[PDB]
Amino acid sequence: EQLSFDELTLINLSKVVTVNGHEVPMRIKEFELLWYLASRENEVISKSELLEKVWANTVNVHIHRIREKLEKESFTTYTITTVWGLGYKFERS
Predict the structure, then answer these.
(1) Which CATH class, in words, describes the domain spanning 1-93?
(2) What is the residue extent of each domain of the chain?
(3) Helical segments of the chain, H only
(4) DSSP strand pairing (78-83 vs 22-23)
């Protein structure tokens, strides 16, 4: 129901993201993508599954938007890694 990775915290029920304790605004589908991956840390998840389970070019665009916001907030200790040809995984850098 809630997940933290260093200064990053995700709160599922309200779909809120915080970095260093302050809310970082995110669309709900973006939160749900970040949560789907972060919930399965170190697991590589395919674009198909992300697309079916969370919801064109929809996945890549939202992965990028997530990455952009985390960069803006200087959160770098974890990341979403591109696994070419297979999908994405949330993991420690």
Answers:
(1) mainly alpha
(2) 1-93
(3) 28-38, 47-54, 58-72
(4) unpaired
